[PDB]
Structure formats: C-alpha cells, structure tokens
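Summary for the steering committee. The consortium agreed at its last meeting that each partner would contribute one worked example illustrating the joint modelling workflow. Our contribution is presented below. We chose a case with several input lines so that the handling of multiple components could be demonstrated. No manual editing was applied between input and output; the record is shown as generated.
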Amino acid sequence: DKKSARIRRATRARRKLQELGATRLVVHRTPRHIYAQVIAPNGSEVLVAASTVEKAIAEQLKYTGNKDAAAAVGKAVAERALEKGIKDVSFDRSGFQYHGRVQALADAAREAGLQF
Amino acid sequence: MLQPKRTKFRKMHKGRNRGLAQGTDVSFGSFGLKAVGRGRLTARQIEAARRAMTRAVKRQGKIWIRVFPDKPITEKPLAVRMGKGKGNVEYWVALIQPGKVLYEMDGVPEELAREAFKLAAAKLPIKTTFVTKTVM
Amino acid sequence: AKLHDYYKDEVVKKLMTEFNYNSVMQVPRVEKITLNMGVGEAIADKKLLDNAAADLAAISGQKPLITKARKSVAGFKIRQGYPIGCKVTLRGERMWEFFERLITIAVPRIRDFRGLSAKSFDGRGNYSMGVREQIIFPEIDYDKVDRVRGLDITITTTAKSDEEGRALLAAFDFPFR
Amino acid sequence: GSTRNGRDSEAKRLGVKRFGGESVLAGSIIVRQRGTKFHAGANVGCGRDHTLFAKADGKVKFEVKGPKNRKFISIEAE
Amino acid sequence: MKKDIHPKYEEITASCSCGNVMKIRSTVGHDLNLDVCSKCHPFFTGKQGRVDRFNKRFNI
Amino acid sequence: GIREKIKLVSSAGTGHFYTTTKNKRTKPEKLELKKFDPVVRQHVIYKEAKI
RNA sequence: GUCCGGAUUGGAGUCUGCAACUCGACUCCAUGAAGUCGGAAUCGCUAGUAAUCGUGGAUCAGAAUGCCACGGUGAAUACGU
RNA sequence: AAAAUG
RNA sequence: GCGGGGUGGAGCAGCCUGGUAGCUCGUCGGGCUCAUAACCCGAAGGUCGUCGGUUCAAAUCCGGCCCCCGCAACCA
RNA sequence: CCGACUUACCAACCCGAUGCAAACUGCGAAUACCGGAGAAUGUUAUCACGGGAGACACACGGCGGGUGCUAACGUCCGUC
RNA sequence: UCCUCCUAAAGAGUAACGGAGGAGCACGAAGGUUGGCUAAUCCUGGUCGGACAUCAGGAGGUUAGUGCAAUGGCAUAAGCCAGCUUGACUGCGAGCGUGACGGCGCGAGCAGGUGCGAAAGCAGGUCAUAGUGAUCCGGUGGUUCUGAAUGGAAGGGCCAUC
RNA sequence: UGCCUGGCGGCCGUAGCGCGGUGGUCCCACCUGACCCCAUGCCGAACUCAGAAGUGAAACGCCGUAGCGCCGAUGGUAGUGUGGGGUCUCCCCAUGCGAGAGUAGGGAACUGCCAGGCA
Ligand SMILES: [Mg+2]
Ligand SMILES: [Mg+2]
Ligand SMILES: [Mg+2]
Ligand SMILES: [Mg+2]
Ligand SMILES: [Mg+2]
Ligand SMILES: [Mg+2]
Ligand SMILES: [Mg+2]
Ligand SMILES: [Mg+2]
Ligand SMILES: [Mg+2]
Ligand SMILES: [Mg+2]
Ligand SMILES: [Mg+2]
Ligand SMILES: [Mg+2]
Ligand SMILES: [Mg+2]
Ligand SMILES: [Mg+2]
Ligand SMILES: [Mg+2]
Ligand SMILES: [Mg+2]
Ligand SMILES: [Mg+2]
Ligand SMILES: [Mg+2]
Ligand SMILES: [Mg+2]
Ligand SMILES: [Mg+2]
Ligand SMILES: [Mg+2]
Ligand SMILES: [Mg+2]
Ligand SMILES: [Mg+2]
Ligand SMILES: [Zn+2]
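What follows is the complete predicted structure of the assembly.
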C-alpha cells in the first residue's frame, strides 16, 4: 500500500511527540487538498484546523492542491491558533517528506507566528 | 526397540512421576490394555509385550502402541565411585501413570483380544486392565 | 509513442468488447518491461559485466543497474553481494518505444524465428522471453561484438490472468505461435 | 573420567525492584531486564542496558497498552 | 531521467527492403537498412508422404 | 589482539590527548577527528600519534 | 581450420546384375569431422635410384587406396670403418 | 658406463 | 584416563591455517628383445573409516560410533 | 530422444486423530515476595551507632529437587 | 577468571568432579544523526543457467536478520540502505541497583563546547548481557603544587597515559 | 438532528481473515503530465511537483454472511497453603485458594474530537 507505508513512516515521530507531551501541528496531503490540524497533547482533541476543503480558503485559490494553497492553509491555521493563543506546537509531517507543499505550509505557518 | 531417532539433549533429570495419565480412552481400535499402576515401561518391555500380543493374534487385525519411551535412563558402571559426572545412557523408558492406555487393537474378537492382552500384560512391570471403546 | 497511441485508440476498445469489462480501468495495461542479463562469467572477469552493461545500455537506451548476489552460493562459487548481472526497468515512453522496436525489428531478426511460445506466461498475465544473441538489435554493431550474450525480457502487465495477458499482447499482433 | 561441563556465570540480579504502587524518587530503578520485556511509559526512562528508571517522583504503575498487548511502566505523580 | 549518464537516445529511420519505413528513437546513431521487418517476415505475414512418392517414381 | 593503542593529540598545542585503539594493518591511514580540548575549551582537530 | 582437408551424414540418381536391406561401384545437390607435420620407437633408398606424377593389366557381370607392369620429372649424400 | 635369465 | 591416527592396490604427504588431493612402488596401453626381466614413452586409479553437525563450501573444523597405535592403569 | 505400466516397498508437506519435555509455552494457579491501609496484640519485638565475642566439621526428620539404583544412617542445594 | 541457559521450588540469591554452550575480541564505522527501506522459504514464467546465481510475478508473513555463545529483546524496528558527521565530547551529577569489602552498574538533569535535523528532538559509543588484572615499582607528556641555607635543579605530588 | 467521507485518537482480534454484495455530487483512490522544486545505486514505479479527461477496475469505506480466527461460562477435574493420616517412589481426609483443556454459548466491534459533502 501507500497509506500503510506512510503511517509506518509517521509513527516514530508521532510517538516521540506523544512522549514529550507536545501540542501537535498535523498535516495531511492528498493530490487535491491539504489539511492542517492542531491537536492537543492527549492526541484526541482538535484545537484548531484549516484546510482547502473549507470554502473560506478554497474560494481564494486557483487550485487546492498546489504549494500556494498549502501556504494559504498554513497561514490560516497559524492565525486561528494565535487567536486561541497557542504559539507553541511541534510539526508532524505525517510521513510525508518535509518538502514541497508540506514545507510551504510549515513555512507559512511559521511566518504567521507559530513557533516550531 | 523404540527410541527417539534424535533428541535435543542426551541426558535427563530423574524427575518424578506424579499424577493421572492423559490418553485414557480407546482412541484408535476397539480394545485396549490400560495401566492401573504407576511406573516406568522400558523399550525392551514394550517390545516383549508387543511380540507376545502380536503372536497371539497371529498377526491379524491392527495393533497400536500408545506409549513411546522418550526418557533416557543413565547408569554408572560397576566399581565406579560417586560423582565424576552423570552416568552414560543405557536404556529408554516411558513414564506411566494410572489410566494410561498402553496398547490398542482392532480387527479381532474380544475373546482373542483379552487372551492377547493377557499374554502381553505378563511381560509388563505395571498392573493393567482390559478396556473397550466407549461412545463418549 | 506509436504503440501507446495504438493501445489507447484500438486495443482498449478491442479488449472491452472481447472480455465485457464494466469499466475502462479494468482493461489490462502494459506496466513495465524489464531486461535482465544474468552474467555469471563476471565471477572472474569484470570487463564481462561492464560489456554486458554496455550492450544493455545500447539496446534499451537506459544505463543499467548492476545486480548483486543476494546470498552466497557454493554451487556457482558466488559470495553474497557479488555483482553477477545487470537489469533495466523500462516504463512509459521508453517502454513503448522498446516494445515497438522489439516487435517490429528485433524479433524479425531472430535466427530461424518460428514464433514466440504462448505458454511463457507466469500465471498472472506477465510474459517473459529469452534472447540468445544481442546482435538481433540493430543498436549492437556486429563487427564490434566481443562476446556472444543474451538477455531476459519480461513484460509485466496489469492482467489478472494469463488469458487476459495473452489477449492484450495479441492485440499488438505479438508474434505468438 | 571428567566432565566437559562445570561452568556458569554470576547471577545478574535482574528483575523488578519497585512493584506496582510503590512510591519512588526520580532516578530510582524500577526494573532490570534483558531487552524490553517491559517498555518505558510516562515519566520512565530506558537505559542503555534496558533498565527502566523513574524520571519523576511518584508511584509505579504497570499497564498493558497498545496493539501488541505490551507491558509498560509509568510513574504517576503523587 | 537522471542527467548525463544515459545513452544518446534520438530518432532515426529504419528502412526495410519491402519498402517499409519506421521512424524510431534509438541509440544506434545512424539510419538503418533492415533486411526484414514485421510487415514482410514470413512468419509474420503468414507465408510459412511415402506412398505418394512411391507412386510418382514408379508409375505403371 | 590485533588492535593497538594510539593517542589522539590536540592540534591546539596544549599537549592534551585522547587514547583509543586502531587496527593498523587494515587501516594504515592516520586517524583524524575533531574533539573537545578541555584546556582551550574548544573543538579542535586531533591527530593520531604513537602511544 | 582457410577457397587447406574431405571423413561423416541427409536428399536425389545411374549402372552391372534374377537380386545391391544386411552388403556394390559411380554421379549430383547439400554437409564439411579429425587433422596445423606426429611420444618412446621405427622403415626404405647409393642414380635415372629415392621422391613425386600420371598410365595400363590380371582376377572380373559388377566390385582396388592391393598386386603386377609402364613411362614423365628427377634429387641429396657416401669424409670414411 | 650398465648388460640378468631361457 | 591422556596423547596420536584411519587418504588410489602398498607404504608415505596434504589437515594445523576450509575452497585448491602430492611422492615412491605397483596396475594398464605402447615400445626395445627371439622372448622374459631390466629400460623407455604414455595413461588410469583415493573421491579421503563411518554417521551426523557447523559452513556459501569439509580430507581439513566439531561431536558421536567402529577400528588401530603409544603411554597410564599406583599406596596399602 | 523420449518414455508406458507396476511395486514385499519407502515416504516429506498438508489435513484429521494420540502422547511426551529440566534447558518447549498461543495458557497458568496455590504459596512466597514487594508496597499501601486499618485494628488488636506483643516487656521495641525494629533500626543505627559503639564495647566484647563465639562461629565459618553440622546431624536427623518433613517438603521441593540435582546426583546415585526415586540404593545407602549416601552425597549436594532450597525450606521448615 | 569471565558470559548464557537449565538444575533454581512463578521476587533476589542458591550446591555438586550436576546437564549444555561460549569469552580473553571486533568496529572511525559495524559509532552519532537525518531520510528512506523490510525478511526466510517455496511455486510459476524467463538466454546460456543446471537443485542452487541474476530477472518478473505470486504465495508466505519474520519460519529471516542481529560482527561472534545462549537467553531476553527488536517493525516506532535494535534488522537493511544512503547523506552529512565525531556525543566513541570535557567537567559534574538528583537518585537508584549490586556487592563483606576492594569495587562494579543504571541515571535524568546542570555548565561548556559540538554533530545531525526545517523542527519537536536525538547523541557522554555499538540491541543488552563475556572481550578481563588490585597494589607496588617504574616509563612518557602536562602542571612550579612542593623544592632540606637562598635562587634554581634533582626527586616527589597532582592530571593524562604506558 | 440524521446519512456519507476525511484526519487524529481511545481500545487492542467479540474488534482479525475469508466469502457475497455495494459506493464516486463531495471526500478518497486510482488517474493525467513532468523542462520544472525534488527524485531513481536504471526506471516520475517510489519520492516530488503541476493538474482534472476518465474510472470506481484496484485500493479503500460500508453493508451482509460463521468457513475460520477470536471471546467464553456453569459443573467437574488437575494442582496447592495450613492441619491431620496411610499401604508413604505415591496418595487420602478437614479447610482455604482453584486452574489448563474442553463443553453450552458469544461473536461480522464499540467510542471521543475536528472538518467536509448531502438531507
Ligand atoms: Mg578444398
Ligand atoms: Mg584442431
Ligand atoms: Mg592452417
Ligand atoms: Mg647396393
Ligand atoms: Mg603414382
Ligand atoms: Mg573388373
Ligand atoms: Mg573453613
Ligand atoms: Mg563448611
Ligand atoms: Mg548442610
Ligand atoms: Mg548423611
Ligand atoms: Mg528466581
Ligand atoms: Mg520462589
Ligand atoms: Mg543458604
Ligand atoms: Mg533509519
Ligand atoms: Mg544503527
Ligand atoms: Mg550495530
Ligand atoms: Mg552484541
Ligand atoms: Mg613532575
Ligand atoms: Mg633549595
Ligand atoms: Mg501519479
Ligand atoms: Mg470495487
Ligand atoms: Mg477455563
Ligand atoms: Mg467480514
Ligand atoms: Zn519489411
């Protein structure tokens, strides 16, 4: 499979972030959409979220699955997180390479003020 | 003479022989010779009993041997003191607990089976009894 | 991409009719062609393996991957990790071009060619065939040839069965006997 | 005659040092083991010889967690 | 494809005796003059006891 | 017992040295590593030398 | 290992002969082996000889690389005992 | 140089 | 009990240190001779005591059996 | 070249049935041990430090065992 | 002398000329980190090519692997590959384990300086448990700490090491 | 509020396999191109990027289905602490604890947060 290998690729970092009790900035990427979630240390409550499936972000974008859309989602999620006053998260790349759309999202979340 | 073709280890702790047997039903034939007592059956005894019963039936029907002598038994040579390491393996035994079906037979009348099992029992160091297959 | 355009324009329709597939994705596809040279003579001479790789590069148009012994084998005097062959994986445009060159040029140049065996399917619609002499490919110059070498060709397909694989290959007028 | 046997190594004093519920100071060794027969849970470290030790003061807690039904040791704050 | 390590792969023309011409990318470098092709090989096209001969040689 | 003892001498001129071992036959090349020199309190190059 | 060599084998024939399976000679097409000068040893030859090249005959329906016979070309060397 | 036997 | 061994038909190497079987005689074929021997030329013949194991791989390393040799098998 | 039949026979893997293990475990006690709490009881029965030692040949019996022949008033551990 | 298993009686420990095996090393990468990856064996198809090389697919699911015994571990791999590297760092060390003792072991965290990583982080050698030798006497380097009237020096100390 | 989907968890086989059916508006998947960012010890397969013609074929999700896996009593049996006894290598009695296996049976998971589509 592809998803199975990716979950396997993601597990080590996820267990480390769980052991550290870090607040997690989780990214998910598909061919058409990118998603970001800030998840509480217990791993089962989503604090904030932004994604290209929400119309408030999809409407301003040429295409939901490129690096510009990833940047928009990263900026949106960091803005929401700072509205709820979070500012300290750990980046979980979910087995995706730290590159391309994921890196654009992470950089845009940084530029918006999220500390990781 | 039955003997394991191979074993992980050459020599074995004496151990004990408590408990009741597993395999207390006639499971392959219609008649069985079941141990009532407790003890060790050597390979030579198992063979002697098998020969007795086999000749009694004139090699008719079928015979199962339900026990296998897998326990090596060592002995020290004569005029050897104690210690200086465990003795050499000299023969093999099967531990026997009360209830153990030792032999089974089919393809003969019960009357010939009892005679054959009686002839076999006489070669054995442990008290035995004649049993028959049950429904449950 | 002549044979790929032929696949899409004709072979898809032909197979849909012949097998009554309920979706166009169900039509068998040619996924990859792998060329393998088992070069055992390399145990003593490494120029043999290098020349095999050069032949494979000329034939397929791709720099080959040198393969190495997975485990040590006394019977062939090989230790684990020893380079004893070379392969190329052909996909996409290169794969269709090689398929065309093979079918239309190289197979016609096989000495005494009387037709490819139709039983050489691995059980899941993948076809493997042997070549005994690399000169059948025009890319190999005849008067530059050092040693006589062959290779293995496997055509891996997305066919669920050997019959679908054979039908897919026959649609390209593969020279089945 | 003699024997080819007659050798053994020193006993290594492995095993559980503090059992479930025991109150321990940070740094205290909870189990000495070969490999991870027990795994490190919350507030518990795993040494180079797979020794599990408290990283915080509190009570030892043995648990079975995860998809492989593996045994974990955590320290719960008092 | 990785750069600078593959053979030169450029189009050529394969001319057969039977007048068939195919434009194929190749590593051969020059143009080709085929003696046979798929369109003319006998197996591709389709162009591929004793009593009889006894009677023919011994006519009575 | 083929590995022989060697010292790694600080290039900082402090005379500080580490010790380690080396298989001299299979690896005749001089071992060189960047290591902490506690005397000048910096990471500097250390060079192999006879024990 | 060839435009050397021509064994072996496939196919098709001819002729003699009641009859060419065992078991003939010859022809045509195809095939194209060993063999690149031969270990120890060993033979013949002193001149029109040796060497080499063809030719004929007896036996004989057919069946010689054998035998008997014939010419052409045509050497080397013999200090000596 | 060696050089047996029938 | 402790050392050492078992390899063409014979007697000896090879083992240690795994890959890759040697020497002398004998045997066979050819030669010299009237013939035989001697002599000359050319070959063949162990698959490593027997079972297992380790190894990619065993004459080789390991363990057990069988056989063979050396010592030792004492004090009362 | 290929191969066609047949076995006094042998027989893997698989499946079903049956046992065996100190150095087997997809299970698993009683006890024992560690920790916590609470009464009663007990001449503090506990721990630390300091003065003085003796002892370091054990024996038998019970239970759990190695060894020996589940021989020994045998031998070697554990525990009472 | 040291390591592993059993004897050993479900905490630790536990004897015998009890039952079985190993060590007296290896490795500047086989260490650190980041990214990636996943075994054995069998079946089918495939030039030479065969029981066994390399190739493709399937079955299988760790029956593989682990530098070397055995046990306990290992997929988030501790197993396989690559890039960059020197944390195989120096000073310390809450606390704990194990020893009659000498001693031996585990360790978060603090200071300094460092490597890998975008980052959270990880790194004070190696999956762990063998691979070892007290003290004396002396050798080498560093350090005036000492320096037998005084300045030096010798010799001693201390630190590193043989 | 309900159905469907995606992400992250709880839990760790009553939850997993097999088998039969099913779904594409959205989501997901395959998919389409690849000079590029980036990549293949060869290969755009993978990783990556730029997209949206096609299909749910595969994958995946959902629903159904006991051929399995799995869970699992009650009763009995084994063992066993303490005390007692015998014919003492092994057992029995009082009392307390009480399996494993098997049997009946259960069983085609359940659940929290956030987001999207549809009603
Ligand atoms: Mg000629
Ligand atoms: Mg020749
Ligand atoms: Mg020539
Ligand atoms: Mg004369
Ligand atoms: Mg002539
Ligand atoms: Mg004539
Ligand atoms: Mg004493
Ligand atoms: Mg004493
Ligand atoms: Mg005592
Ligand atoms: Mg006594
Ligand atoms: Mg214990
Ligand atoms: Mg105990
Ligand atoms: Mg004691
Ligand atoms: Mg890694
Ligand atoms: Mg590593
Ligand atoms: Mg390692
Ligand atoms: Mg190790
Ligand atoms: Mg000094
Ligand atoms: Mg002075
Ligand atoms: Mg794609
Ligand atoms: Mg479907
Ligand atoms: Mg039960
Ligand atoms: Mg189901
Ligand atoms: Zn043509």
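The first helix of chain B runs from residue 43 to 56. The helical segments of chain B are 43-56, 110-121.
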